[PDB]
């Protein structure tokens, strides 16, 4: 079942990476009323807000991550949260960790003798899922600071988190199986 | 117009939808990390059985029991597993206290768009319970039929 | 006028009746999914799990009363039953405590006249347990007396 | 005159004194009946050990754990023992819910004869905890000294 | 202005600090009264109970968090420690929940911005656990490699 | 004994089926103030409602499960609940499942070599109990959609549920015992 | 240790019986303001109320267990509770059960061969304690239906309950020891 | 190693004793608005209080633990609490217990044949931690009898408590190990 497990792990890793990259790139994260001119139905992502319908349908404007005026630097928690949201450090970190896990799996398919590469890939996928969770929480909290809804980029990110956790579990299972087989062979040959 | 009664799933009203989906994600992550820190190291293995019993399904069961404030037959023993368990316990305490602060008030609020609780306010919980019992019966019967078919085929 | 059983006030009578019915159904389904399959028995005959009907009732009572248990289900269907019962218990018990907090704040210390009914229930249960134990002891003693003869 | 703060033992204020003394009596009776129905029958014995572990001290420990909503390593197995345990569990649920409904309100009420809880409102609980730790240390040391003296006397 | 850690609001900061101190003291006293006596050891050497310092800390954490434990004290002094800790836990946790209900009833559904702090704490704990497990695995692997040489 | 358990299971199955079919077919589910034409004390069942006092006593009218109200802002949940209540699909499904379980118990007597019939009967009885619970909850919830009480037709259904669960437990025990005997014979 | 255990059991049984009898007989159960003429400080028990201090100090009047007027019978729970309190059935039952347990202990000390007499005595003492608990609850609840306090007859009843439970535990332990010794002798002789 | 554990225990005992004796003897337990004569920012300790700003900077006055108030309706609990706070009996008792534990460690160094001295040192350190907890609670409760914060003397006391508990655990471990060695030698 090593071949089936490896195929499932690779397919899931690629799917999670692609979903996370698409969610980061696209701008259907939220559906809220707003403007795209520097109150109409607009769809926004992590970088830009674009208006749908109306006279200016299709016009995109970059998201202002520091609204209001006077630049009130009274509470450092708000500034830290706003900087974290503007940088989108956690979704990008999730993308990078998923890419690293996929590269680890690909390299392991070459060497086939260093078991720690599989463990590294599993750790990468689990950490990518955790980073995705943090990024989702940061995005929602920053949005908190008019009925709204979440688009398909948000749910693509959620699905990517789920698949990343599943692939991490599969990679850990493969590492455990490899070490069990090594121990069994050593016991038989001793 | 007529005052609207709480919905069939009004027991989810004390928390927002984002909180619920983040709780689900946190639960999945906690179970996965608990399984990882429990089972990955070959030095916790002795064909070969593990020192602990925290496989992925057992980890999910333990985390669910911790969230439901119930507990199971097992408990983590290692340092890394106990860190996961303690932080999950703190999360559960905070979240469950916040959820159960005003559950009855959320279950009976009438919206235009002290009294005893009525069965209509918990009918959804009862429906979910009966559906779960039916699903468990179906799963058990499917497993039984599969095992019987496999045994018969092995015999012949 | 409050009675001695005013602690049942926060929930309706229908809720209590349906709680009893749900407890019975959950215990029966748990025992069924734990014990019916011949492949869950190994080789009198010994079962893999300990979830007979009496043990299943004890487990369900402990889960509902926020008191735990000495055994836990291990199979998929048994764990489905246990999880759905845990969810039901959490919702129902939380609702009862929230409505009781609402009822008690309609700071005045609670009087013994409001919990006399629960005290009576406790003493009646203790008397019933003593009677049951004595009946079982007498039956076993008579059986042993017949065996000696 | 100056407003009087709650006493050092204000955590007992939610219930009346009669309720507390009746709770103590009920706890003693429950433990005694549990021990009786568990250990009296010679048909539950095998120099000879019992099938269960519900001696009087273990019964008291189990009943105390049940009241504090904690649980211990043991649980009754017989029909009469489980009847005792179930009725005690129901009693505990009712009494503990009634007690914990408005504990914070009872701990901060000012009497002439939302705000966070302060340490002065729970200082009595802290004092009781430290006194219990000291008593446990003293009991352990007394047992150790007695055993050491007995062993030395047996040697000589 | 509420923060991300507003769930700690119902209790004062001094109460949290003293809770931490009390937890440490209870764990240390439990381990001491369980393990100091040579007559509690039988015949490396095996202790009658399982209440070492790490296990005592785990037991105290489980008792405070309303989560139970896999072990329970059996001696008189250990049970005194456990009972007084149970009493402290019941009072403190009940007061926290009552004051949290008061804080939340100053029906509006809770927002994620009020529990983001607990989510951050959970993720930080998971990361710390993974790092600790990896460090332990690396140390064991290095020791095994040295033994191979 | 196997024969004693067989007799107990058959008697309990028949009793539960009779209680359920009586509860479905009688008109004493509830006592409440109402009207039996087109406000006196009135006893009502699942289908029809009759007054028991005054000049209108003894007149039964079919229950109007879909009253001609304003009906604006009518969520699909309320319509689904009232359709389920009007159809009475769950009490009748419970009756059908009890009948099927009784047939399985009867059929096993002529096919003693087959053991899965006993298991099927146990499943039928447990499912009948679950359907009974759902029907009771549906009935009580639809009643809420101020003095009232339940009559013997309601408690007949409750007793039928309890008996059905007991008979299902007994049937599962019989199945377990039969397979235990089979394993003991096969081993030796 | 049979002699010490038997001596403790007999002494405790006698003490509990005497305390319960004294509590039932005497009238220092409660200290509440009232009258003894068919508002002064009065002490009352289960049967009569007597005034202390004042011009009518020492005058005793039987307790009226059905106060107010019109003899309302709307609720049967109140009537049942009032009848139970007026009869004092549970304290008297506790006294009777304690006496039966003491007689069982004496008879066992005479026969010394039937072990079930010890078990009967233990059951009697436990049941007497439970009856005393019920009687206390009934008395307090009936009193509920002006600062007050409880006299020494009330606390004598409480102490009797405690001693009865302890003596029941001791009797059960003696029964267990007798059966253990019988089993050990049978094993040795077989 | 036994020597490593002895060195760690001695270093920790000395550190805890030094931290406690510094906390007792310095005046930075609390920062609050107050008066140092006979309303500016003020740092206060257990015994005396001094202002840190204005013309009154650097002037220290003894804390009035029994202010000349109206004093009527003075329950014994408040008087007992303020007497305990004024005496500072628990921080000083903690210092004394830490010193006794250190003396026990030294005596065990000079009396290695005796093992109960290590146990006595462990008991002393645990008791010092408990006394520290009680003193902290007493201090905070007496402070309540609206902006303030704690200075480094308060946190020195807290760190001393933590270190004392750790050193007590280490001493108990050393006692257990010594008795384990004794049992192993006696067996073989
Ligand atoms: Ca509450
Ligand atoms: Cl974007
Ligand atoms: Cl009808
Ligand atoms: Cl009298
Ligand atoms: Cl100072």
Residues of A in contact with E134 (CB under 8 A): 123
The partner residue sitting opposite B40, judged by closest CB among A165, A172, A180, is A172
Non-local (6+) Cβ contacts of A82 within 8 A are: A65, A66, A142, A145
Q: What is the domain class of A2-189 according to CATH? A: mainly alpha
- Residue A24 structure tokens: 């980061």
Going from the Cα of G60 to the center of ligand 4, the distance in angstroms, rounded, reads: 9
Going from the Cα of A88 to the center of ligand 2, the distance in angstroms, rounded, reads: 10
The three-class DSSP label of residue E103 is helix
Residues of C in contact with G133 (CB under 8 A): 119, 123
Q: Does D56 touch chain G (CB under 8 A)?
A: yes
- Find the Cα–Cα–Cα–Cα dihedral G31, G34, G38, G44, rounded to 10°: -10
Which of C89, C69, C105, C70 minimizes the C-alpha distance to C26?
C89
Non-local (6+) Cβ contacts of G96 within 8 A are: none
CB pairs under 8 A between D and E: 130
- Find the Cα–Cα–Cα–Cα dihedral F174, F180, F183, F184, rounded to 10°: -120
Extract the runs of DSSP E, i.e. beta strands, from F63-123: none
The CA distance from F64 to F44, in Å, is 12
The partner residue sitting opposite C10, judged by closest CB among B71, B96, B116, is B116
- Is position D4 within any domain? no
Backbone angles phi, psi at H50, to 5 degrees: -135, 145
- Residue H92 structure tokens: 């000083």
CATH number corresponding to F2-25+84-187: 1.20.140.150
Looking at the fold, whether B129 and B104 belong to one and the same domain comes out as no
Non-local (6+) Cβ contacts of E75 within 8 A are: D140, E33, E34, E40, E49
The partner residue sitting opposite E113, judged by closest CB among A127, A130, A141, is A141
Kindly state the DSSP code that residue F56 receives in the 8-state scheme: T
Q: How many residues does chain A have?
A: 190
Kindly state the DSSP code that residue B116 receives in the 8-state scheme: P
The CA distance from D110 to D1, in Å, is 12
Q: How many domains does chain B have?
A: 2
The CA distance from F171 to F117, in Å, is 10
Q: How far E17 CA lies from chain H's nearest CA (Å)?
A: 9
Going from the Cα of G10 to the center of ligand 4, the distance in angstroms, rounded, reads: 28
Render the burial of C101-111: b for 16+ CB within 10 Å, e for the rest. Answer: bbbbeeeeebb
**Cross-chain Cβ contact C38/F184 below 8 Å:** no
Helix (H) or strand (E) run with residue A41 in it:
strand A40-44
Going from the Cα of C25 to the center of ligand 5, the distance in angstroms, rounded, reads: 68
Q: How far C78 CA lies from chain D's nearest CA (Å)?
A: 21
CB atoms within 10 A of CB D74: 16
The three-class DSSP label of residue G44 is strand
User: What is the per-residue DSSP string for D51-118?
Assistant: SS---HHHHHHHHHHHHTT---S----SHHHHHHHHHHHHHHHHHHHHHHTTHHHHHH--B----PBP
Is there contact between D and H if contact means ≥3 C-beta pairs under 8 Å? yes
Looking at the fold, whether B84 and B133 belong to one and the same domain comes out as no
Domain layout of chain F by residue ranges: 2-25+84-187
Looking at the fold, whether D74 and D17 belong to one and the same domain comes out as yes
CA atoms within 13 A on the CB side of H93: 17
Non-local (6+) Cβ contacts of H139 within 8 A are: H29, H46, H85
Q: Does G65 touch chain D (CB under 8 A)?
A: no
Looking at the fold, whether D61 and D99 belong to one and the same domain comes out as yes
Beta carbons of B52 and E147 less than 8 angstroms apart: no
**Chain center to CA of E23:** 8
**Cross-chain Cβ contact F75/B130 below 8 Å:** no
Looking at the fold, whether E94 and E135 belong to one and the same domain comes out as no
Looking at the fold, whether B135 and B152 belong to one and the same domain comes out as yes
Looking at the fold, whether C35 and C105 belong to one and the same domain comes out as yes
Q: Which subunits have 3 or more CB–CB pairs within 8 Å of chain H?
A: D, E
Q: Does B130 touch chain F (CB under 8 A)?
A: yes
Residues of F in contact with C21 (CB under 8 A): 133, 136, 158, 161
CB pairs under 8 A between B and E: 127
Q: What is the domain class of G2-27+82-182 according to CATH? A: mainly alpha
Residues of B in contact with E93 (CB under 8 A): 93
What's the CATH code of the domain at D72? 1.10.287.70
Print the domain residue range for B134.
122-156
Alpha helices in chain C, H assignment, sequence order: 13-35, 53-64, 76-104, 116-148
Going from the Cα of H66 to the center of ligand 5, the distance in angstroms, rounded, reads: 16
Residues of E in contact with H133 (CB under 8 A): 18, 21-22, 25
Residues whose Cβ atom is located within 5 A of ion ligand 3: F 27, 45-48
Looking at the fold, whether E117 and E61 belong to one and the same domain comes out as no
Kindly state the DSSP code that residue E44 receives in the 8-state scheme: -
The partner residue sitting opposite F180, judged by closest CB among C14, C31, C45, is C45
Resolution of the experimental structure, in angstroms: 2.4
Q: Does A176 touch chain B (CB under 8 A)?
A: yes
Residues of E in contact with B94 (CB under 8 A): 7, 115, 118
Looking at the fold, whether C92 and C127 belong to one and the same domain comes out as no
- Is position B1 within any domain? no
Residues of F in contact with B133 (CB under 8 A): 130
Q: How far C36 CA lies from chain F's nearest CA (Å)?
A: 6
- Is position B84 within any domain? yes
Burial group, residue B154, by CB count within 10 angstroms (0-12, 13-18, 19+)? exposed
User: What is the per-residue DSSP string for H26-89?
Assistant: -S-SEEEEE-----EEEEE-SSEEEE-SSTTBT-EEE--SS------S--HHHHHHHHHHHHTH
The CA distance from G22 to A67, in Å, is 83
**Cross-chain Cβ contact E87/D133 below 8 Å:** no
- Is position B3 within any domain? no
For residue A119, give the chain B residue with the closest CA: B40
- Is position C53 within any domain? yes
Is there contact between D and E if contact means ≥3 C-beta pairs under 8 Å? yes
Beta carbons of C25 and C57 less than 8 angstroms apart: no
CB atoms within 10 A of CB G66: 11
Beta carbons of B116 and C99 less than 8 angstroms apart: yes
Residues of C in contact with F187 (CB under 8 A): 43
The partner residue sitting opposite C102, judged by closest CB among B104, B125, B132, is B104
Is there contact between F and B if contact means ≥3 C-beta pairs under 8 Å? yes
Looking at the fold, whether C131 and C80 belong to one and the same domain comes out as no
User: What is the per-residue DSSP string for E51-69?
Assistant: --HHHHHHHHHHHHTT---
Pairing status of strand A60-62 against strand A48-51: antiparallel
- Is position C145 within any domain? yes
The CA distance from F151 to F49, in Å, is 13
CB pairs under 8 A between A and E: 30
Q: Which subunits have 3 or more CB–CB pairs within 8 Å of chain F?
A: B, C
- Residue A106 structure tokens: 């690909």
Looking at the fold, whether C96 and C121 belong to one and the same domain comes out as no
Angle of CA points H94, H95, H100, to nearest 5°: 95
The CA distance from E59 to E26, in Å, is 10
CB atoms within 10 A of CB E119: 25
Q: Does B9 touch chain F (CB under 8 A)?
A: no
Name H34's bridge partners: H40
Mutate to test the interface with B, among E71, E115, E139 (most CBs of B within 10 A): E115
Ligand nearest to the Cα of C99, by number: 1
Looking at the fold, whether D40 and D69 belong to one and the same domain comes out as yes
Going from the Cα of A92 to the center of ligand 2, the distance in angstroms, rounded, reads: 13
**Cross-chain Cβ contact E36/H122 below 8 Å:** yes
Residue position matching structure tokens 């398919």: A109
Q: Which fold would CATH assign to domain H2-26+80-187?
A: Butyryl-CoA Dehydrogenase, subunit A; domain 3 (1.20.140)
Sheet of H60-62, strands arranged across: H60-62, H48-51, H40-44, H30-34, H148-150
């Amino acid at each position: 079942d090593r071949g089936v497990q490896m195929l499932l792990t690779t397919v899931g890793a690629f799917a999670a990476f692609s979903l996370m990259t698409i969610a980061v790139g696209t701008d259907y994260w939220l559906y809220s009323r707003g403007v795209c001119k520097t109150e109409v139905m607009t769809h926004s992502g992590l970088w830009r807000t674009c208006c749908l319908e109306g006279n200016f349908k299709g016009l995109c404007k970059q998201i202002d991550h520091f609204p209001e005026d006077a630049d009130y630097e009274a509470d450092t928690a708000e500034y830290f949260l706003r900087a974290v949201r503007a940088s989108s450090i956690f979704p990008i970190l999730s993308v990078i960790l998923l890419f690293m896990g996929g590269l680890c799996i690909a390299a392991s398919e070459f060497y086939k003798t260093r078991h720690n590469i599989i463990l590294s890939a599993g750790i990468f996928f689990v950490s990518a899922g955790l980073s995705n969770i943090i990024g989702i929480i940061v995005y929602i909290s920053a949005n908190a600071g008019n009925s709204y809804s979440y688009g398909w980029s948000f749910y693509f990110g959620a699905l990517s988190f789920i698949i990343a956790e599943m692939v991490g579990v599969l990679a850990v299972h493969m590492f455990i199986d490899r070490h069990k087989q090594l121990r069994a062979t050593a016991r038989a040959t001793d | 117009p007529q005052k609207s009664k709480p919905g069939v799933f009004s027991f989810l009203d004390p928390l927002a939808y984002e909180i619920w989906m983040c709780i689900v994600f946190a639960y999945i992550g906690v179970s996965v990390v608990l399984f990882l820190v429990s089972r990955f190291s070959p030095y916790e293995w002795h064909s070969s059985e593990s020192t602990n019993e925290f496989g992925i399904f057992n980890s999910l069961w333990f985390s669910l029991g911790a969230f439901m404030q119930q507990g199971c037959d097992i408990s983590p023993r290692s340092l890394s597993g106990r860190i996961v368990g303690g932080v999950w316990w703190f999360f559960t305490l905070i979240i469950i206290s916040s959820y159960t602060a005003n559950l009855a008030a959320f279950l009976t609020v009438e919206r235009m768009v002290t009294s005893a609780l009525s069965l209509s306010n918990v009918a959804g919980v009862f429906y979910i319970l009966v559906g779960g019992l039916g699903l468990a019966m179906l799963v058990a019967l499917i497993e039984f039929c599969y095992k019987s078919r496999a045994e018969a085929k092995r015999m012949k």
